[PDB]
Design a binder for this molecule. Structure first.
Ligand SMILES: COc1cc(O)c2c(c1)/C=C/C[C@H](O)[C@H](O)C(=O)/C=C/C[C@H](C)OC2=O
Length: 270
């Protein structure tokens, strides 16, 4: 807008905000730490990077989506204010230099599925891009989807080069899978590339890079992660069916020290 904050709307302008420092800048535009002088809040603001010629609200109730506060147009940028939050998934894989524990992905899966499920059943949204970059973790445990928009072509389903985008949600389902496998194993499914198309091919060519029976993965997991990576998108699981899979059900209830973990992974590197 306008800046809306639990749960009053204020007007200000990005030049009004006080700026504390940056966070990257590490693709795509300078993301910024800054304080809204009005109320005392400290937020994220992602500067882009105009222009095309010539968003949320209202995902305020869902606790698994990073909350947007408003935007924020100038002649050069496009500023978007978001809740301040730890880090990407993608950057934890690299920072950890090794996989994330099944327990954490299980939490993740739950935060993530319910988000996509939220968006679809409340806003008729089909968020195109489900991937590690878009999954934000935080110091105090929370796990959230950034609704935004080889490598990032790899996450494409089979039926996204077939007989006629899109048909339908099931494509995000796929990207959830690959994200999980990428994430569980700490190694992108297709090590043989890049970059790329010798990727896109493999996908429609070959059978899902399902989870290795080897690394000690609760076959509840292996099961879920496979229901997703179903080639045949037709009988593939809608979000609800995933919501009543067992791997989910476990993880809806099972208590996990996500804060504790994250913090510890902040031991290395820094
Ligand atoms: C909402 O609070 C945030 C807090 C952050 O620290 C980042 C972002 C948001 C960014 C969201 C959009 C992209 O996910 C991001 O540009 C990216 O690819 C880099 C991820 C690793 C980097 C160090 O962390 C952030 O910058």
């Amino acid at each position: 807008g306008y800046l809306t904050i639990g749960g009053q709307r204020y007007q200000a302008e990005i030049n009004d905000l006080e700026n504390l420092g940056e966070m990257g800048s590490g693709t795509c535009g300078q993301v910024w730490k800054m304080r809204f002088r009005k109320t005392g809040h400290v937020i994220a603001v992602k500067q882009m990077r105009r222009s095309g010629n010539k968003v949320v609200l209202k995902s305020h109730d869902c606790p698994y989506i990073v909350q947007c506060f408003g935007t924020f147009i100038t002649n050069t940028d496009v500023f978007i204010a978001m809740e301040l939050m730890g880090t990407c998934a993608e950057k934890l894989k690299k920072r950890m230099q090794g996989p994330i524990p099944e327990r954490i992905l299980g939490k993740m899966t739950v935060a993530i599925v319910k988000a996509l499920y939220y968006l679809k059943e409340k806003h008729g949204v089909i968020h195109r891009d489900v991937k590690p970059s878009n999954i934000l973790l935080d110091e105090r445990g929370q796990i959230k989807l950034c609704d935004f928009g080889a490598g990032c072509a790899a996450y494409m389903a089979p039926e996204r080069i077939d007989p006629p985008p899109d048909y339908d949600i099931r494509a995000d389902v796929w990207s959830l899978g690959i994200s999980l496998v990428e994430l569980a194993t700490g190694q992108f499914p297709y090590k043989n590339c890049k970059t790329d198309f010798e990727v896109l091919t493999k996908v429609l060519q070959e059978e899902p890079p399902l989870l290795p029976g080897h690394m000690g993965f609760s076959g509840d997991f292996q099961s879920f992660v496979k229901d997703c990576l179903t080639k045949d998108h037709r009988k593939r699981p809608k979000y609800n069916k995933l919501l009543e899979h067992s791997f989910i059900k476990r993880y809806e209830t099972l208590e996990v020290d996500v804060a504790s973990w994250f913090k510890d992974v902040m031991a290395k590197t820094e």
